[PDB]
Amino acid sequence: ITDDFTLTSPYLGFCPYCRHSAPCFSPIKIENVWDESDDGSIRIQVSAQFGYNQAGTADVTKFRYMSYDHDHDIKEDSMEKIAISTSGPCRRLGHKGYFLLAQCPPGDSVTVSITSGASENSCTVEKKIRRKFVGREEYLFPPVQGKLVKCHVYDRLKETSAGYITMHRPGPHAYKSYLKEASGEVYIKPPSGKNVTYECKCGDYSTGIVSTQTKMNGCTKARQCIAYKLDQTKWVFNSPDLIRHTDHSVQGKLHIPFRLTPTVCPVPLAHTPTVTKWFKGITLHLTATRPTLLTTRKLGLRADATAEWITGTTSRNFSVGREGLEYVWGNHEPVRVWAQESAPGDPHGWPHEIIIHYYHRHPVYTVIV
Amino acid sequence: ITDDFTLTSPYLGFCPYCRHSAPCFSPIKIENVWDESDDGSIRIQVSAQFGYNQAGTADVTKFRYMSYDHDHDIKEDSMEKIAISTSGPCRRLGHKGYFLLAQCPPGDSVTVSITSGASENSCTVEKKIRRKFVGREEYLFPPVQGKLVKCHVYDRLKETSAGYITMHRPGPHAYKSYLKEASGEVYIKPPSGKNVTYECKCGDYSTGIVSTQTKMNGCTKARQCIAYKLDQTKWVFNSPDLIRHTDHSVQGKLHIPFRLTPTVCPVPLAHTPTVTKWFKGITLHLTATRPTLLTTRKLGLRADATAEWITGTTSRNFSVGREGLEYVWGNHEPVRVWAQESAPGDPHGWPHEIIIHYYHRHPVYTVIV
Amino acid sequence: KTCAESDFVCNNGQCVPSRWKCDGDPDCEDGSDESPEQCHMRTCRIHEISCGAHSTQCIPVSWRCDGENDCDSGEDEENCGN
Amino acid sequence: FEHATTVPNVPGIPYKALVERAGYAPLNLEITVVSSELTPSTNKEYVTCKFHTVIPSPQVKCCGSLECKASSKADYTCRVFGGVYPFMWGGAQCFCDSENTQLSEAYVEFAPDCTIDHAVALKVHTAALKVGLRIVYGNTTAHLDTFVNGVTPGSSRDLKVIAGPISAAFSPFDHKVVIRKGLVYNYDFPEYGAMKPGAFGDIQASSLDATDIVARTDIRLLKPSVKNIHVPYTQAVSGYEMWKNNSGRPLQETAPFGCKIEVEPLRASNCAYGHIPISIDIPDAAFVRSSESPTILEVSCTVADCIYSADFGGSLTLQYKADREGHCPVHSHSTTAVLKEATTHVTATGSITLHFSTSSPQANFIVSLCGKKTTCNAECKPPADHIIGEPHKVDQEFQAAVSKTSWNWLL
Amino acid sequence: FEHATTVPNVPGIPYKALVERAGYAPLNLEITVVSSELTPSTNKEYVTCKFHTVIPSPQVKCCGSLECKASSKADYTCRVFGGVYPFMWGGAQCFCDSENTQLSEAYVEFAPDCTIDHAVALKVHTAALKVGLRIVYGNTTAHLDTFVNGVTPGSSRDLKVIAGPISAAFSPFDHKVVIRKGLVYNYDFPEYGAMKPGAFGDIQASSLDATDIVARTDIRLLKPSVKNIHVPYTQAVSGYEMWKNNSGRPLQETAPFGCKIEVEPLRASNCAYGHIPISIDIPDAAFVRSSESPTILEVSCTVADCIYSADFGGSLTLQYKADREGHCPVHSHSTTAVLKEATTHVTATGSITLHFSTSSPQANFIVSLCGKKTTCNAECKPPADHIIGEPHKVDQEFQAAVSKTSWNWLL
Ligand SMILES: [Ca+2]
Ligand SMILES: [Ca+2]
């Protein structure tokens, strides 16, 4: 793995949106978004390196920008200008390299943008992030007091390795501003002090390295000739929006921060039900202000489990036999209920009560006998 | 009942949700949110007195709040830093003492926050807020012209009163920074120019009053001995996040402003129905772009009333007898319709078609005769 | 009995929830819950300032130029304004 | 001079009648009712609204123990938990470990804003009746509002009327009724003292400002396990709010016979049912003997077109001759035919036109011009319009609703 | 001395028994099951998670021939296109018009954060059964564990208990079972090397970090037709997530007989079914001669009002006359009446109070106190409350469940 950060550079990407809501070339193009945390956090990967200075001296409040204009270099701006949003503004929890953490309200799109400055840009990608809870008993805010259950949250500390991302040597980067159409001939020009590597085919293939305005052998249209810089060697990410180099082998491996780490988290407990006991049965006077789960199952040779997200203040009639019945309610521990044989009547005294007592229990054995 | 605010003081609550999405100790804790109005008005009660300066001389643009510093005194801040929001920003309508009124669109949580630079907190509780209309013909905005009914709306004037609140003696409040653990024993260090009291079971139960650092006898751990101050006398509300005094008697009262009052109130009128007349029946031709209630009933011994919310452009068929029915569409006044006999066929017909007219009327009583 | 794997283990073996660890508050008898050995630290808390730059002793910020020393060294009653 | 009759109890629809004596010309006597309320006796027992739990600050005793004694405040639930270490913004609130306890308590009291949203529970019975009726006799109008029992009289300017018991008695209210915000429901609420959580009547109180109220909401306290100090509690859903959600239709839009219902005295006004008998005496000052009353003879009938409906459909013309000019009341003795007009100006050999309404296919009814009777019959056609906004002035009767042609056919 | 016995497999409840040898004092014997987990023999074959499609930068050649090779990456796919014109920020990337070619590329990999929600596929068979016994006899306690097969004894320091084969046999696990995040499901995954696009097992791997990933998600590239450069692709919906959406109720809340399924070794601990017979060899040291056990004369049993219920309802009392102080085991020789205590202290002429839990309307059961056998008959009523949180002690047995009165009524 590699951790030195002075020999890699940001890059431009084809953002599906922009400030003017058009297919756009922006330096804040984003590749992936992950929302596999039980807290609402989001890991966003952008195309502009965060938390590092121009030379990569690891400054907290600076980030690379990769300016628009020709003779492209890497400049920086203050980190306070960055601001991400989903449906409203949302907080930022960390930043390192390409990746920056987040925590945002549920919505339908993820936006990262630069607020002020000379250039303002944005990037939106369709991704359905919706509120998620932990365990059962759907809630909206974590309660002050409740049962502790095992969660899975991102680690906001930057020095936590989560994965493996690759880079490659940069590819050719052509420019239109390096060609001149003045008369029936083709002129090229490099920037002040730079040595471009011009090469084009009209009549035959040719190349070369020049420093000033250089003539062509002879050839009409300059649209068909290209030129690019060769003084670049900084690594770039394996993005689907770059020209591949001739070799394209892995050069250095760097980390994806904010490893998913197990932890504990509180969850609400429901209101304890009130139980009414009737012969070979049970009724529950349940109540819950938010969707809560209630699961039952028998203890015999057949289970026939039932699960239903109840939301109001209802009353459910369950049937419990001699074998038994267990039921859970919200996050509470399972509780078991066993039914005995207690039917109206009497097994003594007179036959007219003996038959009544023996009819409710085993209503077919007494009939045949 | 008293109205002077020089004898009271704010207190520190325990808001379940601060800005950083975690349980916290906050000075802007809110207790209740009453939503029994009819224009969306809300009476939020918080743990900070509004409309008074540090000494409580009834200043419009100042409010009090306890300080986080260990020498806890009541501090000051400008009033225009207080904002209310549920889903969009709410617009403040008044403030007096703990309470303040607001109005803003429905959401699922009510938040108040200080948006300053020095101290910035944002409490939040879970309250179900849904828009409420008056009468029938559900509407969004009160229409310009319509009939006037009896609404019930909070009045913005702060001089009203509907309620009965209480305050009690401020309980003990210990600070962990009043103890020291220098070498082996504990040092009780009072603040500068103030008197604190220490009660502890260091070896045996003991107590004392001092204003300068002293040396305890038989102490080995800082935790064992705790010292608190005795300069708390102003009355405080009995919130469930405080510690009650040794007596805890009602020692003063204040009003709950923004009482509920009746007020004349507009409400839209639905489109007038188009009636078509058919024998022993009615065919209303309704229309409505929003949920409108249509209710009918008979005039005989059995009412068989019907009420149904309609939302499209549909037609309903009703049956009217000799005694007639009444239908009350939308907000309009009741109208009564009586039906007579118009069965086809002449009751003096020369051919034997006397039966058919006497058949629609009295369908059964004519078959036997 | 056997201590739960979900709870923290003190030097005294007291079992407490993992949330209470590393919060600047002694939740356990021997204080190992906030000791520098069990929790990595560099900069001190907001309300406490390092003293001496050798012992790294942290004391409340209100304990400055009060007339009484509050450190194992003598750098407590100087560099304070009138 | 008393006269006994039964006026149908239908407000707004008068009915016509006369009185006959010895040597005295008949005079018009029509009885009409304008308003009729039906007020039953009520007995309030409690008033309820949504609660608002007030949980006082918990009590902690350092290095000790305590016990809590019950009180009389509504649903006072108390518990004590041993071995707590409370924390707040300044930590270490107790100089004791696993030996200091805390006291948790909770109760229920009326909401600060439900002084308008309160629901009152009533229990009605013995629904009486009173009616205000208009009497016109001898071209003189009087207004009286008497009761319905056959005892209490109504007197104003030598006008005594007696109202007998109604043929049929009912009330639109059930045994138990409940009022909120000026509209009456019809619900069966629990008796005063047996509350059930999550249903109506969760809170009972004699009045909204009473000191001692009683209620139960199964407040149950959990065990505090959080680092700081705060009492936990769970509670049943407020019963009054649930009933408001699941109220159903109010009695304003469900009462039969069209009794629109007010709420201030809990009345039930302006509806029609049954028959109310009436006995009335008339002073002789409005009576005219036969000496000055013109005598009319040679009465005759002919009608242009008759059509039976609720409104005055048929048209009737009269031909006559008399000896003196004056006023002569005209009336129809048949119960399936009424006359719109009450008095007419009679001449020597004039001819007047009259309007009548009838509910029978045949207009076979007699009339009495100053006591002179004659037959009068014709055939009436059904109306084309089968929807109107005027109640029928007469009721259907047998041996009259059957047409003469069909009557002959089946005979 | 060995003693064959049959013990029902219901954890928690005891099973009293008495072992007697001629010329020796009787010894009490109780057998209690405290843990019973059945561990199937598992065999992982692959694991899966949500695949993360990666698309490397497309390589373009300015009008030269291009074709890719075949690699071992998961679901590799090449597509070469002709007649393109990529447009980057500096436009006109290639110099050659309408003859340059570009090739696409796409292969799937495990997600960077799917190390925490990987689904494990298992195949299980031959479910064993291990039980932790607990037996006491004559004031000494023994704790031991043993299997269920009929050969291997789970030996204690002195004991030798051979648990016989269990009559009933079942396994809540089916032939194939998946695992994820500690929840045990019941599925039938596709076998290794035969994937299905959009179903479970979309992407397969022997290990989490293994390089032999095989997957099939039927990706298909498209010919670009936009001015700038970007490689378009269409992908089938992720299969593992689609399975997660409608996963269904896990086996933790569906397995019969009340088993609670653990996940780390894939257990099914603490559930009740069938009867497991055992053969226990009591060491000779525990016994004692008959000359040391107290002798008792005239033992009489009187029964107080009882109820045949799960809990210890029935009361008992005895009268006797012994000759010397001592402790004498008690036990009843009926298969439908379990006692409460085994050892009791016997004085000269005292009385002992017992408890029992019958399942028969009448108590015609023999009580054997220290060898002497007595019979006592009685009659008692069904239980009042009909819901208990304690499992039953004995079975119906369909014989003693019929009352004596009913018996002599039928016969
Ligand atoms: Ca701690
Ligand atoms: Ca100092």
Concatenated DSSP letters of A91-118 = B---EEEEEEEEE--SEEEEEEEE-SSS
Q: How buried is residue B8: exposed, middle or buried, by Cβ count under 10 Å (0-12/13-18/19+)? A: buried
- In terms of Cβ atoms closer than 10 Å to its own Cβ (0-12, 13-18, 19+), residue D47 is buried
Mapping DSSP to helix (H, G, I), strand (E, B) and coil, where does residue D48 land? strand
Q: Round to whole Å and give the CA distance between B91 and B112.
A: 11
Quote the CA–CA distance of D28 and D140 in Å, as a whole number: 10
**How many angstroms separate the CA atoms of D329 and A170, rounded?**
119
Q: Let me know: does A345 contact A356? Beta carbons within 8 Å.
A: yes
Three-state SS string over D92-116 comes to CCCCCCCCEEEEEEEEEEECCCCCC
Burial D304-338 (b: 16+ CB within 10 A, else e): eebbbbbbbbbebebebebeeeeebbbbbebebbb
Q: How far is CA D135 from CA B263, D24, D152, in A?
A: 42, 20, 18
Rounded distance, CA A128 to CA A130, Å? 6
And the tokens for B125?
A: 């509780």
Placement of tokens 């730079």 in the chain: A194
Q: Do B322 and D359 touch, CB atoms closer than 8 A?
A: no
Q: What is the DSSP string of B85-110?
A: ESSSEE---EEEEEEEEEE----SEE
Count CA atoms closer than 13 A to A368's CA, side-chain side: 3
Closest-CA residue to B121 (of B10, B26, B11) = B26
CA distance B29 to B12: 7
Cα(C17) to ligand 1 centroid in Å equals 10
Task: Indicate the SS3 state at residue B361.
Answer: coil
- Residue B30 in contact with residue B125, Cβ under 8 Å? yes
3-class secondary structure, E260: coil
What single string gives the DSSP state of each residue in E19-88?
E--TTB--EEEEEEEEEEE---B--EEEEE--EEEE-PPPEEETTS--------STT-B--EEES-----
- Show residues of chain D in contact with A271, CB under 8 Å: 234-236
Identity (one letter) of the amino acid at E385?
D
Q: What 3-state DSSP class applies to B40?
A: coil
Give the integer Cα–Cα distance in Å for D250 and A180. Answer: 86
User: How far, in whole angstroms, is CA A125 from its chain's centroid?
Assistant: 12
Q: A36's torsion region: left (phi>0), alpha (psi -120 to 50) or beta?
A: alpha
Residues 6+ positions from A297 with CB-CB distance below 8 Å: A303, A304, A305, A306, A325, A326, A327, E253, E254, E258
Buried/exposed B320-353: b ≥16 CB within 10 Å, e otherwise: bebbbbbbbbbbeeeeebbbbbbbebbbbeeeee
The CA distance from A161 to B356, in Å, is 93
* Domain residue limits, chain D: 2-39+126-174+254-281, 294-409
Q: Which two tokens stand for residue C13?
A: 């073996």
- Measured from the Cβ of residue E77, the count of other Cβ atoms closer than 10 Å reads 17
Report the distance separating Cα E178 and Cα E191, nearest Å: 12
Three-class DSSP category at D397: coil
Q: Are strands C48-51 and C57-60 parallel, antiparallel or unpaired?
A: antiparallel
Please give the DSSP secondary-structure letter assigned to residue B368: H
B positions 124-163 inside 8 Å of D (CB):
150, 152, 162-163
Cα–Cα distance measured from residue B332 to residue B270, given in angstroms and rounded to the nearest whole number: 8
For domain E293-410, which architecture applies? Sandwich (2.60)
β pairing state of D380-381 and D306-307: parallel
Closest CA to E316 of E378, E373, E361, E371: E378
Provide the β-strand partners of residue B263: B151
Contact A14, A23 (CB under 8 A): yes
Distance CA B65, CA D356 (A): 85
Q: Do chains B and E touch (3 or more CB pairs under 8 A)?
A: no
Fold of D2-39+126-174+254-281: Tick-borne Encephalitis virus Glycoprotein; domain 1 (2.60.98)
Task: State the Rg of chain D over Cα.
Answer: 36
| Cβ–Cβ pairs < 8 A, chains A and C | 8
CATH for E2-40+125-172+255-284?
2.60.98.10
The closest of E144, E122, E141 to E133, measured between CA atoms, is E144
Residue D268, classified by CB atoms within 10 Å of its CB into exposed (0-12), middle (13-18) or buried (19+), is: buried
What's the DSSP call for residue A365?
Answer: H
Q: How far is A143 from chain D (nearest CA, A)?
A: 11
The CA distance from E17 to D384, in Å, is 99
CB contact at 8 A, B35 and B42 = yes
3-state secondary structure of E409: helix
Domains parsed from chain B with CATH numbers? 30-170+251-266 (2.60.40.3200), 176-231 (2.60.40), 270-338 (2.60.40.2400)
Longest dimension (CA), chain E: 122
Residue C20 near chain D (CB below 8 Å): yes
β pairing state of B281-285 and B274-278: antiparallel
Q: What is the DSSP letter of C3?
A: P
Q: What is the dihedral of CA C64, C69, C73, C76, to 10 degrees?
A: 20
Q: What is the CA radius of gyration of chain B?
A: 35
Q: Report d(CA A151, CA A162) in Å as an integer.
A: 17
Dihedral sign for Cα atoms in the order B247, B253, B256, B262: positive
**Amino acid occupying residue D340:** K
- Taking the centre of ligand 2 as the mean of its atom positions, its distance from the CA of residue C34, in whole angstroms, is 24
Under 8 Å CB-to-CB from B172, ≥6 apart: which residues? B228, B243, B245, D93
Q: What is the largest CA-CA distance in chain B?
A: 128
Whole-number Å distance between alpha carbons of E88 and A13: 9
Strand order of the β-sheet with A253-254 is: A236-237, A165-168, A253-254
Q: How far apart are CA B43 and CA B255, in angstroms?
A: 13
What are the residues whose beta carbons fall under 8 Å from the beta carbon of E89, sequence distance 6 or more?
A12, A25, A68, A173
Do chains C and D touch, with touching meaning 3 or more CB–CB pairs less than 8 Å apart? yes
DSSP element (H, E) containing E242: helix E239-245
Q: Are E93 and E102 in contact (CB under 8 A)?
A: no
Tokens 């503004």, residue located: A89
For residue D404, give the nearest of D347, D361, D352, D366 by alpha carbon: D361
- Resolution given for this structure, in angstroms: 3.9
Strand, helix or coil at A353?
helix
Q: Please give the structure tokens belonging to residue E227.
A: 């001015």
- DSSP label at A358? H
Q: Enumerate chain B positions whose Cβ falls within 8 A of a Cβ in C.
A: 69-71, 177, 180, 189, 191-192, 213, 223
Residue of E nearest to A236 (CA): E57
Alpha carbon separation from B112 to A178, B9, B15, B33, C38 (Å, rounded):
58, 20, 11, 12, 38
Experimental method: cryo-EM
Q: Which amino acid is at D14?
A: P
Degrees (nearest 5) of the Cα angle E97, E98, E100?
85
Which residues of E are less than 8 Å from A303 in CB distance?
A: 254-256
**Residues A27, A67: Cα–Cα separation, whole Å:** 8
- Residue entry with tokens 């006991």: A277
Closest C-alpha among A311, A317, A268, A305 to residue A293: A311
Contact D110, D52 (CB under 8 A): yes
Alpha helices in A64-193 (DSSP H): none
Q: How far apart are CA A101 and CA E41, in angstroms?
A: 43
- CA–chain centroid gap for B105, Å, is 13
Beta strand pairing call for D154-155 and D140-147: unpaired
Counting ligands in written order, the one closest to the CA of C17 is: 1
Cβ atoms of D53 and D106 within 8 Å: the answer is yes
Closest CA to A45 of E113, E109, E226: E113
If one counts every other C-beta atom within 10 angstroms of the C-beta of residue B195, the result is 13
Ligand 1 midpoint to CA C35 (Å): 9
* Fold of the domain spanning D294-409: Immunoglobulin-like (2.60.40)
CA dihedral sign of residues B155, B159, B164, B168: positive
Amino acid present at B131: R
Which of E74, E71, E378, E52 minimizes the C-alpha distance to E235? E52
Which residues of A fall within a CB distance of 8 Å from D220?
272
Question: How far is the CA of A162 from the CAs of A110, A255, D339, E113, E118, in angstroms?
Answer: 22, 7, 101, 7, 15
Nearest ligand to the CA atom of C20:
1
Q: How far is CA B61 from CA B12, B54, B92, in A?
A: 22, 12, 13
CA distance A301 to chain E (A): 6
* CB contact at 8 A, E115 and A161: no
CA dihedral E168, E174, E175, E176 (to 10 degrees): -160
Return the ligand number nearest the Cα of C67: 2
Which 3-state string (H, E, C) describes E76-143? CECCEEECCCCCCCCCCCCCCCCCCEEECCEEEEECCCCCCCCEEEEECECCCCEEEEEEEECCEEEE
Q: What is the DSSP letter of D382?
A: P
The answer to whether A200 and E96 are in contact (CB under 8 A) is no
The CA distance from D29 to D16, in Å, is: 6
C44 DSSP assignment: -
Q: Residue B312 corresponds to which amino acid?
A: G
| CA A140 – CA B34 distance, rounded (Å) | 20
DSSP code for A35: -
Going from the Cα of A156 to the center of ligand 1, the distance in angstroms, rounded, reads 20
On whether the CB atoms of residues A197 and A227 are closer than 8 A, the answer is yes
How many degrees, rounded to 5, is the angle at CA D112 between CA D201 and CA B57? 170
Query: Dihedral of CA E194/E200/E203/E204: which sign?
Result: negative
> What one-letter code names the amino acid at B178?
Y
Report the distance separating Cα E59 and Cα E86, nearest Å.
Answer: 11
N-term to C-term CA, chain A: 84
Total count of residues recorded for chain C: 82
Q: Which residues of chain B make contact with D167, given a CB cutoff of 8 A?
A: none
**Cβ neighbours of residue B34 under 8 Å, at least 6 residues apart?**
B42, B43, D112, D113
Task: Write out the two tokens for E193.
Answer: 């090397």
What are the structure tokens assigned to E281, written together? 């060899």
- Using CB atoms within 10 A of its CB, is residue D133 exposed (0-12), middle (13-18) or buried (19+)? buried
CB–CB contacts below 8 A, B to C = 14
Closest CA to D102 of D235, D222, D219: D222
